[model samples]
Structures are given as C-alpha cells and as structure tokens.
Target: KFKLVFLGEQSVGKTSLITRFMYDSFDNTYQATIGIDFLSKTMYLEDRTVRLQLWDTAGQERFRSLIPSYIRDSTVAVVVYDITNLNSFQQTSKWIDDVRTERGSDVIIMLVGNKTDLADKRQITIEEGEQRAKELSVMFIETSAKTGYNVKQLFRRVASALLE
Candidate 1:
C-alpha cells in the first residue's frame, strides 16, 4: 500500500478531491476534516495490486505541527490549492516546504491546484502553477473535484511518481 497525504489551506478542496478520486462522487456541501481522515482506494497498475491510503489533514494553522507527523514515511504528498483564490495558491509553497523538510527529498510531492471548474474566476493560470511545480521539482495538475475532472488522473499520476 502507498500512503499519500493531502495538505493545503482550508476550503482548498482536498476532501473533495479525495472523494472524487476514491469514490467517484462529490458533495456540494463541505464537511470539514477535523483532526484527520483516512480514506483508501485500490487500483490495478500493470497487474500490480496497488492500494492507496490517503490521509486528509485539516488546513488550519493549528494543525501545522501535526503535518510533519502525518507526512512522515508518506509515499507521496499532495498539496492542493484553489485556483480561484490567490491566497490558496500562495500557501502551496509553505505546504510543500514543510512536507519536504519533514518527509525528506526522495518523497514524491505533487502540487494540485483544484477548482478548475471555476476557471472564469481563476486567479492562477495553469502555466503559472506548472512553472512553480517545475521550480520545486514536483508535478502540477489543475483539477475540479466537483466536476470529476482530472481527479482519477491525479491519483494515477501521483501513484506513478511513487513508483519512480
């Protein structure tokens, strides 16, 4: 099983992304991920039985200290952000930095700028996010958990990163 941790600011759609990818469902309402939530999904990768244990962490400042512990020994760290919100995109750096510091250099880290369905109000461009991810040496993807766009691809792509 591969362990992946999703870290980002509040309302950045980490929970939604997880649900959309794991269950192929989305909830219009938000249910805040209190302390921590563990969700798992299984998929076959080239005849290999692969299971993903995703840890969805709360995005509050109070939960910052818990990030290192949650990210420890993680196979992949996905930092999600809202493309429509500049603050969320800005917070990606902090989240990625913390993950790298705690999880070490070899850990697979991906930057996910979610809420692509709201492209009309997008404040961050895909090129911009991709450039940022390149600078960090991590992959970047823009997805809409609500619309089920690129959600599964995100998981599969990250899983591939873990195998690399």
Candidate 2:
C-alpha cells in the first residue's frame, strides 16, 4: 500500500480533489473539514495492485504542527490550493518547507491549483504555480476536480514518481 497526504489551506478544495480523483464525483455543497478524514483506493499498475491510502486534513493553522507526523511515512504529498485564492498558494511554501524538513528528499511532492473551472476569478496563474514548483523541484499543475480536468493526470504523475 502507498500512503499519500493532502495538505493545504482551509477550503482550498483538498477534500474535493481527492474525492473527485478517487470517486469521479464532485459536490456543490461543502462542509468545513473538522479534523482529518481517511480514504483508500486501489489502482492497477502493470501487474501490481497499488493500494493508495489518502489522508485529507483540516487546513486550520493549528494543524500545521501535526503535518510532520502525517507525512513521515507518506510516499506522496499533494499540496492543493484554490486558483482564485492567492493566499492559499502563498501558504504552499510553508507547507512545502515543513514537508521537506520532515520527509525524504525523494518523496513525490505535487503542487495543485484547484478550482480551475472558476478561471474567471483566478488570482494565481499556472505560471506562478509552475515557477514555485520549479524552484522547489516538484511537479505543479492546475486542476479542476469539478470538471475532472487534470485530476487523473495528477494522480498518474504522482504514481509515476513513486514507481521511479
């Protein structure tokens, strides 16, 4: 089984992204994630059945201290944010630094800008996210869990990173 953790500022669509990728569904209604939610999915890669265990966490500032523990054994760490919310993207750095300080150097880290479907209100461009990812040597992409855009690709990329 492979462990993956999703971290980002509150209401950046972390839960929605994971739900859309794992279940192929999205919801218009949302409730604040109180604590942490655990989910699992199994996908086939060649002849191996890769079990992915995902940890969806609360984006509260208080939760930052708990991140090191959750990402300790994680194979992939996905940091998601809302494209319309620049603050969320800005928070990615702090999260990235924390993950890097706590996890393995080769661990797969992905920067995801969610809510791409709301492009009209986008405050952060793909270039900005890409530049940040490049500086950190991690993968970056803009995705819309609502439209299913780049969702599978993001997971596939993360999976490929793990396989390598």
Candidate 3:
C-alpha cells in the first residue's frame, strides 16, 4: 500500500478528484473538508493490484497545521490546484515545499492542475503546469474531476510510478 496525500488551497477540488478516482463519481455541491478524510482504493494495474491509501486534507488555513504530520510518512504528495484560479496554482509551490520539508527527497510529488473542464475561465495554461513541474522536478498532470478527464490516467500513472 502507498500513502498518497492531496494538498492544496481551499476549493481546488481535491476531494472531487479523489471521489472520481475512487467511485467514478462527482458532486456539484462544494463542501469544505473539515480536517482530513481517508479512503482506500485498489487499482488493478497491468501486472499488479496496488492499494492506495488516499489522504484528503482540508485546505483551510485553520487546518494547515495538521498537514505536515499527514504528509510526513506519505509515499506520494499530490499537490493540486485549480486551473481557473491562478492563486490556487501559485500556492502549489508552498504545498510542494511543505511536502519536501516533511518527506525530503523520499516522496514522489505530483503537481496536478484540476478543473480542466473550465477552460473558458482558465487562468493557468497547460504549458505553465508542465513548466512548473519541470522546474520543481516533479510529475505533472491536468485533470477535470467533473468530466472525469484524465482522472483514471492520473491514478494509472501514479500506480505505475510507484511500481517503478
């Protein structure tokens, strides 16, 4: 099993992304995660069945103090952001920094840009996400939990990376 923690600012759809991956579903209602929520899913890959321990963290400032301990022993840190919101994308650096501070070089960090379905309101481009990931030396992918675009691919990629 791999411990994967999702980190980001509020309303970036961290829970939505996980919900899509976990049950192939999405909800339009926006509910802020209180502290941390946990779920487990087993991905049947090409040659292996990998179990992922998903950690959905609250993005509010009040819950920021609880993030480090959750990230400390994680196998992967999924730093997510909303493509339509530039502030959320910009804040990814701090989230990534937090992961690095907690896990050092031992964790796999994936920079995810969510809400790709809102391309009309997009403030961050795909190139920017790729560039940022390159500069930070982390894996990157863009996904839309609402439309389920690239959601499966994201987990497949993560599972693949873990096996590698």
Candidate 4:
C-alpha cells in the first residue's frame, strides 16, 4: 500500500481528480469544514496491484489543522495547480515547499497541472510545467477531470513510481 496526498488551493480539482480516478465521477462540493478526507483504491493496471490511500487536503495556512504529521507520512505529495490560473501555478512551489518541510526527498512529489480542458484559458504552458517539475526533481502531468484526461495516467504514474 502507498499513501498519497493532495496539496493545492480550493477549486483546483484536487477532489475532482480523486473522484475521477475512483468512480469516473465529478462533484464540485468535495469540501469539509474540519476533518480528514481520504479514499482507498487498489490499482491493477500495471497491473501493479497497489492499493493507494489518497489524502485530500488544503494548501492554505487556514487549513493547517490538516496537520504536518500527515504529510510526514505521505508517500507522494501531489501538488496540483490550475493551469489557467497563473497564481495557482506559481503557488504550486509553495505547496511543494510545505510538503518538503515535512517529507523532504523522502516523498515522491508530483507537480500536477489540472484543468487542461480549459486550454484557451491556460496561463501556464506545458513546457513551463515540465520545466518546473524538472527543476524540483518531481514527476509531472496535466490532467482534466472534467474531460477525464490523464486522470488514470496520473495515479498510475504515482503507483508505478512507488513500485519501482
């Protein structure tokens, strides 16, 4: 089993990605006032047979109640950003920093550029996303939970990376 956590601001589709991966569904209201949200799924497509514990969290100081200890135990810090929102893209580094503050190089960090379906609104280029991932020494992918693009590939990449 592997533990993965989502780190991003609200509306970045962090929950969307999780739902898209789990049930091929999407819900805009994946919020909680004060609690933990997680899902477990066993992947068989590498057929890796890997079970993933996906943790959903907030990326702001307001949600600090989510805790540093949870991040310390994360196997992958999935730092996501809205490709159409420049600020969100820029804030990804900060989210990664938050993860690094606890996990360091011990965790497999993935820089995810979400909402690729909004190509016309894209504020960050694919090259830029890749470059940031390279600079941070983390995995990278662009996904659209709305269009169901690369959602599977994202989790698969995380699962395979863990196995390897």
Query: Which residue pairs collide in model 2, if any?
Result: none
Q: How close is every model to the real structure, measured as TM-score?
A: 0.96, 0.93, 0.98, 0.92
Q: Candidate 4, after superposition: displacement of residue 111 in Å?
A: 0.5
Minimum summed lDDT over a 10-residue window in model 3 is located at: 155-164
TM-score: model 4 vs. ground truth? 0.92
Cα displacement (Å) at residue 25, model 4: 1.0
Q: Model 1, range 1-164, lDDT digits (tens) per residue?
A: 48999999999999999888877899999898887889888876755768889899999778767778888868799999999999999998888988888877868888998999997999999999999999999988999999999988898888877666
Best by TM-score: 3
Better of 2 and 4 by TM-score: 2
lDDT of 4 by residue, 1-164 (tens): 49998888767888889889999987655564244487899888664488799888855567776657778889898989999999888888778888888977888988999999999999999999999999989999999998899999998888888888
lDDT ranking of the models: 3, 1, 2, 4
Clash pairs (backbone) in predicted model 3: none
Whole-model lDDT values for every prediction: 0.89, 0.86, 0.93, 0.85
Candidate 4's C-alpha lDDT?
Answer: 0.85
Write the number of the candidate with greater lDDT, choosing between 3 and 4.
Answer: 3
In model 1, state the lDDT of residue 35.
Answer: 79
Poorly placed runs, candidate 2 (over 4 Å): none
